[PDB]
Design a protein around this ligand. Structure first.
Ligand SMILES: Nc1ncnc2c1ncn2[C@@H]1O[C@H](COP(=O)(O)OP(=O)(O)O)[C@@H](O)[C@H]1O
Ligand code: BEF
Ligand SMILES: [Mg+2]
Lengths: 417, 112, 48, 417
RNA sequence: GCGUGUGGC
DNA sequence: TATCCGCTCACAATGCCACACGCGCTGCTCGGCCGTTATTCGCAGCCC
DNA sequence: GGGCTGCGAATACGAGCAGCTACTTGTGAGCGGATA
């Protein structure tokens, strides 16, 4: 039987079937431990077991199928796999493996993968024929990812400003340049809703780095997608491990020719974690950053590219400035040229409670002509020429007042005539 | 027939034995009499460390064997080279090869 | 027994190890190689 | 057989001939690894092998012929060469060596160069008779490199402004003084097209430092020339290594009496990389720059000179200002006197969408009289006297409006009467 | 732990 | 087919005592592990 | 009364394998081995 079907259900039901098939009182162990005990109890009845999870290859060659319960960490519910299959089906870190498994024998601690049935939502023998991620040629964003819902509620316009300030496409590299306390969480809420609504075909992934658990349980119950998180209550090692594993899953997925999008709050916190785990090189910069500490965060962010053969990988990260320490400033400094898509936010407007507090002229999109039509992009240029001589707060409030009347952005352009 | 005769050499240096035998066959230009030295003894399995993916890709019981036709002179050639610790095979000095089932088995092992 | 077979930490990187320990290691290695040969359906001459 | 003929072809064809000559399934390894496996498989048939690549001399004396696949880095497809040939044919870093090679034997890891056939597109015994780069006397630019196409399309005028604001010649030292988001990429597009069209005899080389991979795959498929790049996804060590190797190849080429041109975006990013690799000297300046960190970038940029004996070396780099950090400002400061050719760009004009956004009076060419005729340079002076009292945007738009009618610049001068 | 060398009863 | 006869191999070489030194580097080949077991500190019985 | 020490609770690629003699005589038993 499948593991996730027993992992998603509440613990009380697990206790019910546990005492149904004759087990102990199951109100004492952890939810992971209750899942593990139920799994062994149902497995000792001589039945074909199935499992699924993301592969993490160890130092010795063998691998472990981790589950999304603890953001794919070291756990007793991980499925041990021998290097023999890792060489036959040529699996790497980030490959979502699912197939028949068996229980751990005495002296063994983890389940063993016997039959593989599906590798990254594909046939396992097809996983042998593939090109590696560092091998395909990138490109610019061609297919437009319109984030407008079209219903025009009081928050739908929140996405329209994007289509009015910075268009987004497949394979783009986006980040938000925003001070603390601006409303980045709700803009990510709206953009995730827009991805789930307009383009539900692309893989919607949300990565949370060093944030409040309330935001975790809020996003994990709002969008219908894999939400992997890493709150502040965990060390930086776990954060960079999640970075490894999520970027590897995205790499394997785009190798499978799929459109994936990874949302990140925050990139400055991930940079802090990488600074925390990197060995000392002896060259520290202003703010407390090391010389060779930002290489891995730069890789993680710039993994975004548009694939020529098929698929795309998009990264939408958030950065913090006006925090008080030189560190986050230099983070935004050497990360300001790495991305090709910016959401500049103004705390100045957030003090006036005018949401969204987006800075129009400082924001933009790199090579945005390949996502829009000629006359549409000319409309964008005329709108920029209208907003530019105006101020900041007055221009933003004028934009929201002009969008409050219509719902679709093409209709707004039509009245803009 | 181009038989698959088995021989054992000095262990540890078995790659050195492979290249020495290859160079010796290529020097005497006797390719029409001899063959390969079991280069497929390269199991790419490894201990894949983090941030350092140096992989030697070598895992096999050794036993460098050469595909060859049985001849006394050829035997003297293959024993004149170093690392001839054991010329295995049930015989006095002239053994017999192994059937094609084990050849298919080692071909499967190479496939893996 | 371990404390009975000569194995004493010598001065430097080397340590005085019993000569019997080398034969023991060779025996264990040959036994492991034999176990690996039979598990892989090896020919009769190599296992011989 | 030759290596590049097997490196330029797609991987699928490599798999085809691989299973044609009886090899494994070749849809699993890297494109470099697939090339290497195909090379060994075709080499084990007893045939004369040929190779070609740029030489990189190691610390121990021996050398390696690197290939343009990974911007000439450490790879398994590099051809190891003994110091004996490096002393007989007197080879150094940057020498493009091509000739007969052989496969690596067991215990060896790289191909071995046996017969040399061509050194920097010249006979190898002729490479012994040469003068070293630091030995010839520089000069001013004498032969005019006209970048005007003559067809006068909507972007050809982009080059004409150059011939109207800053003339270019052989051995010149050019750099663009431009803020971010001005259009430097498309001006480099036009100038590279103009070099490929007007003067296809000179070696057209493009060096990319810490930029988007989409620009890499765009330039590498637009101009027919060696495009070596180094994106942000690689460390600064690789960037300065590419600096070493490209400047060494250019030095060897001009020692071979050839006209080479190296295009660079960006010089500020290369300066950042050099700052990253330089050991600490204890004297840091404003912006986070070291005292003895800019020596190597100054050398790399000022390697441009006009040769008395024959050949020329031109450098066209780009610098960033108005970025927010003191660093790039001081970069432009101590690099503003090092070059003798400037393209001053105005973001002010880019906000009005008037391309090209070039600043006329701040730009110029040092000793430009040796590239133009007397009456032609007098025409240039009268045009400068016309543009100078006028403003910035009005003067630029007047220039583009005057060039929109004619295609050739001599014809523009003829109507200017 | 031994081996080797040397010397002595 | 029995009776010695000739070729081949194992086994021995005091016992002790004293002093000193001497016991190599590199290219294949094989096995394989969690932050709940082992480290470290707070507390109290027992002798000085 | 206080130090000394036992007792229980809180807590977070590297090893291995392997390579690059011919002045000893005597005493005993074991294994072919020739010939009636
Ligand atoms: N000659 C031109 N014709 C039409 N559009 C142009 C031209 N030059 C620049 N642009 C516009 O300017 C933008 C240039 O983007 P980019 O290359 O990133 O600028 P820069 O290189 O200055 O940062 C494009 O979106 C394009 O629409
Ligand atoms: F290429 Be842009 F000016 F960053
Ligand atoms: Mg550009």
């Amino acid at each position: 039987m499948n593991l996730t079907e027993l992992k998603n259900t509440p613990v009380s039901e697990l206790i019910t079937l546990g005492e149904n098939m004759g087990l102990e009182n199951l109100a004492r162990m952890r939810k992971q431990d209750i899942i593990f005990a139920i799994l062994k109890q149902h497995a000792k009845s001589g039945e074909d077991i199935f499992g699924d999870g993301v592969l993490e290859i160890l130092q010795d060659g063998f691998g472990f199928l981790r589950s999304a319960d603890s953001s794919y960490l070291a756990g007793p519910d991980d499925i041990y796999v021998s290097p023999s299959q890792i060489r036959r089906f040529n699996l790497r870190t980030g490959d979502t493996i699912s197939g028949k498994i068996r229980p751990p024998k005495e002296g063994e601690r983890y389940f063993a993968l016997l039959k593989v049935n599906e590798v990254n939502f594909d046939k396992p023998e097809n996983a042998r024929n593939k090109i590696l991620f560092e091998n395909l040629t990138p490109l610019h964003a061609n297919s437009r990812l319109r984030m407008e819902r079209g219903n025009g509620s009081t928050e739908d316009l929140t996405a329209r400003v994007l289509d009015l300030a910075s268009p987004i496409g497949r394979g783009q590299r986006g980040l938000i340049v925003a001070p603390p306390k601006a409303g980045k969480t709700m803009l990510l809420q709206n953009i995730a809703q827009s991805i789930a609504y307009n383009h539900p075909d692309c893989v919607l992934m949300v990565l949370l780095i060093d944030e409040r658990p309330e935001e975790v349980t809020e996003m994990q119950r709002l969008v219908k997608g894999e939400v992997v998180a890493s709150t502040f209550d965990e060390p930086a090692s776990r954060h960079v491990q999640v970075a490894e594993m999520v970027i590897e899953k995205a790499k394997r997925l785009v190798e499978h020719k799929k459109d994936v999008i990874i949302l990140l709050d925050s990139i400055t916190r991930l940079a802090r974690a990488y600074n925390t785990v990197v060995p000392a090189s002896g060259k520290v910069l202003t703010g407390g950053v090391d010389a060779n500490a930002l290489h891995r965060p730069k890789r993680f962010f710039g993994a975004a590219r548009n694939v020529e053969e098929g698929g795309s990988l998009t990264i939408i990260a958030t950065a913090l400035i006006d925090t008080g320490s030189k560190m986050d400033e230099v983070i935004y400094e050497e990360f300001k040229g790495t991305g090709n898509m910016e959401l500049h936010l103004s705390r100045k407007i957030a003090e006036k409670r005018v949401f969204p507090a987006i800075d129009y002229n400082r924001s933009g999109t790199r090579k945005e002509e390949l996502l829009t039509t000629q006359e549409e992009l000319q409309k964008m240029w005329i709108l920029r020429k209208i907003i530019h001589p105006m101020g900041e707060i007055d221009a933003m409030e004028f934009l929201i007042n002009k969008l409050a009347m219509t719902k679709t952005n093409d209709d707004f352009f039509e009245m803009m005539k | 027939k181009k038989r698959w005769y088995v021989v054992q050499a000095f262990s540890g240096f078995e790659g050195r034995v492979a290249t020495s035998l290859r160079e010796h066959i290529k020097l005497h230009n006797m390719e029409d009499l001899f063959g390969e030295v079991m280069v497929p003894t390269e199991e790419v399995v490894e201990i894949r460390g983090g941030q350092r993916r140096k992989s030697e890709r070598k895992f096999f019981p050794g036993y460098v064997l050469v595909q060859m036709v049985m001849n006394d002179a050829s035997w003297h050639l293959v024993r004149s080279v170093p690392r001839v610790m054991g010329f295995i095979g049930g015989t006095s000095d002239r053994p017999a090869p192994i059937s094609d089932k084990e050849v298919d088995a080692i071909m499967n092992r190479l496939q893996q | 027994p371990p404390d009975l077979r000569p194995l004493v930490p010598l001065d430097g990187g080397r340590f005085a190890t019993s000569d019997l320990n080398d034969l023991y290691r060779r025996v264990i290695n040959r036994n492991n190689r034999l176990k690996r040969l039979l598990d892989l359906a090896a020919p009769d001459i190599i296992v011989r």
